[PDB]
Design a protein around this ligand. Structure first.
Ligand SMILES: C=C(C)[C@]12C[C@@H](C)[C@@]34O[C@](Cc5ccccc5)(O[C@@H]1[C@@H]3C=C(COC(=O)Cc1ccc(O)c(OC)c1)C[C@]1(O)C(=O)C(C)=C[C@@H]41)O2
Ligand SMILES: CNC[C@@H](O)[C@H](O)[C@H](O)[C@@H](O)CO
Lengths: 536, 54
């Protein structure tokens, strides 16, 4: 075998299978070759910063990945050295994990990967009727279904979630079961296992809490069982809880607004209460406001600990949680200054109140019409203004320091005022009063004119064109982003729920087959769906 | 016939016609089937907020 750092573990059997030499494989297995050798070189492992071919490190997974069912049947069934269908590589991936890994959502890839997956499952059921390969988790704790959901393999999900086997002795592997079919309409049951309740890591969690790099994060929710589940959960109980939370937040903001508006104007907090109705309602509003701030604070910390987001995607995702957290931080700083005998608590309070209203736009998420505006604002603030800030600051600093250098003891002779006035020129709020008596007036006018042409005309309209691109690019994507917001909202509402009750099952605990490989009968909480199709 | 809320009034003639069984339809009409029966269950009525086959 190879003993280098790059081809570590490559042996003759891997070469034979890769070369599609059935004869040499048969001879090698007949001659006592090891069918469980691990090809664990850097070439053979999952990697980012180097080309490679990760297949699962084993001859069986190599045959499976390369679309050679004959070799798979040989390795599993041959008596000289049968292969272990449940073998796990260094990553913990089985052959099914390897097959899911090498998918890429193309037509031929979908076809042969689906076929090989199906045939491997049938062979496993015949050879090992008590073995459930799909329940095996890799080192990351992912089943093949969870792995496919995580990586955004649309074809593998579209196969697995609605899988139906029309063959006896293996129908217990099916996840879709058909109850009836009429002319255009037909009713079926879907298995639902490890979609809603998994105890480790469900499909809906994996889709919703993905890192936003998944190429088909939105389309995964269009697959029919998930779409029906989210619609059912929405209509059943989540919609009312969402509206109730929105209403309570509105009441909170109204109380905070009223409490802030009637603040006292004397010096040196804290301010003594008087035996009058106004002070009692005022301090009540203060207490409720600080209470809400503390609530949001702890919710934000719980979110960050549960998700553990990285910095690179800290703001790409988790935008709304960050803003709610920042609001609560401003409230707490206001409390600290209030009890520290400083008037400047007012400043902190004011900012929180401002955010307290604008974060109301979070509750537009999940409405098909109004949700788009929050997303447009988020993308524009994160993408376009963030990049354009440096270009504009270069122009601002250059022209400001030029002008400040030119003037000798005028109104412009200070960085503060000059920068403010140039910013006003950028938005069209200038003065242009050339009624002064300083020298080099022509140079000053040329500088101001060049700045105004460069910033008011050229740069600002470039910015506006880019924002127009971003706005019009996601206007038609609303139908999907709505669904994704709906999904994450539902999962959060079910997750917290603050009553310890988790009666979130969908349909009856029904029996499908009744004839396991053993004498048991499997009740799997299947969910009924009726679908319409006008074909032919 | 079915006596539920969804398939009310459906009889063998409707099933045979849906299945495209000319022979069974001819036999059923020959055996005294009612060709004017009303299958007015919720599955077979016009509706917006439910699938069906009107
Ligand atoms: C921490 C961040 C990211 C942030 C906090 C403050 C300072 C913020 O300005 C920014 C930077 C900024 C400032 C001024 C103009 C544009 C951008 O963006 C947000 C942040 C951005 C906004 C504007 O964003 C919104 O439209 C609200 C909003 C949109 C979408 C949402 O999903 C959402 O969920 C809570 C909220 C509101 C402010 O918090 C606000 O009220 C004040 C006073 C400034 C805005 O800094
Ligand atoms: C102070 N300089 C600003 C004005 O020139 C202003 O642009 C115009 O008057 C018009 O927008 C409103 O009067």
């Amino acid at each position: 075998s190879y003993t280098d750092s790059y081809y570590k573990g490559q042996t003759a059997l891997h070469i034979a299978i890769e070369r599609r030499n059935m004869t040499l494989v048969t001879l090698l297995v007949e001659n006592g070759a090891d069918v469980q050798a691990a090809a664990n070189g850097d070439f053979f492992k999952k990697t980012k910063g180097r080309p490679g071919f990760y297949f699962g490190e084993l001859p069986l997974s190599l045959a499976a990945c390369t679309n050679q069912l004959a070799i798979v049947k040989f390795l599993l069934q041959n008596s000289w050295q049968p292969a272990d269908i449940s073998a796990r590589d260094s990553v913990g991936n089985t052959v099914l994990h390897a097959l899911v890994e090498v998918a890429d959502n193309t037509v031929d890839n979908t076809k042969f990967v689906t076929s090989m997956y199906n045939e491997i499952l049938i062979l496993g059921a015949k050879l090992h009727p008590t073995l459930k390969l799909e329940e095996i988790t890799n080192r990351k704790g992912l089943t093949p279904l969870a792995l496919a959901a995580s990586s955004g393999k649309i074809g593998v999900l579209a196969y697995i979630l609605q899988r139906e086997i029309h063959e006896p002795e293996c129908r217990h592997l099916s996840r879709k079961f058909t109850e009836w079919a009429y002319g255009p309409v037909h009713s079926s049951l879907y298995d639902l296992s490890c979609i809603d309740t998994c105890e480790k890591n469900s499909v809906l969690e994996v889709i919703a809490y993905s890192s936003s790099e998944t190429p088909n994060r939105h389309d995964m929710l269009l697959v029919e069982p998930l779409n029906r589940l989210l619609q059912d959960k929405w209509d059943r109980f989540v919609k009312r809880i969402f509206y109730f939370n929105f209403f309570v937040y509105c009441l909170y903001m109204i109380i905070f607004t009223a409490a802030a508006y009637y603040r006292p104007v004397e010096g040196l907090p804290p301010y003594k209460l008087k035996n009058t109705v106004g002070d009692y309602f005022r301090v009540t509003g203060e207490i409720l406001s600080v209470s809400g701030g503390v609530y949001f604070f702890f919710r934000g910390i719980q979110y960050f600990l549960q998700r553990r987001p990285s910095l690179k995607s800290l703001f790409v995702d988790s935008y709304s949680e960050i803003l709610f957290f920042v609001q609560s931080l401003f409230m707490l700083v206001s409390v600290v200054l209030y009890f520290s005998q400083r008037k400047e608590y007012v400043a902190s309070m004011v900012f929180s109140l401002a955010m307290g209203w604008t974060n109301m736009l979070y509750y537009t998420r999940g409405f098909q019409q109004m949700g788009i505006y929050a997303v447009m604002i988020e993308k524009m603030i994160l993408r376009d203004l963030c990049r354009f800030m440096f270009v504009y600051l270069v122009f601002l600093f250059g022209f400001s320091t030029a002008v400040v250098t030119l003037i000798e003891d005028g109104k412009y002779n200070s960085l503060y005022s000059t920068c403010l006035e140039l910013f006003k020129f950028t938005i069209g709020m200038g003065d242009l009063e050339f009624t002064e008596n300083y020298d080099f007036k022509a140079v000053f006018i040329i500088l101001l004119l060049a700045y105004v042409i460069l910033t008011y005309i050229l740069l600002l309209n470039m910015l506006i064109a880019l924002m127009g691109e971003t706005v019009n690019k996601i206007a038609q994507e609303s139908k999907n982003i709505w669904k994704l917001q709906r999904a994450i909202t539902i999962l959060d509402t079910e997750k917290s729920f603050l009553k310890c009750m988790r009666k979130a099952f969908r349909s009856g605990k029904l029996l499908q087959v009744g004839f396991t490989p053993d004498g048991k009968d499997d009740y799997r909480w299947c969910f009924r769906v009726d679908e319409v199709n006008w074909t032919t």
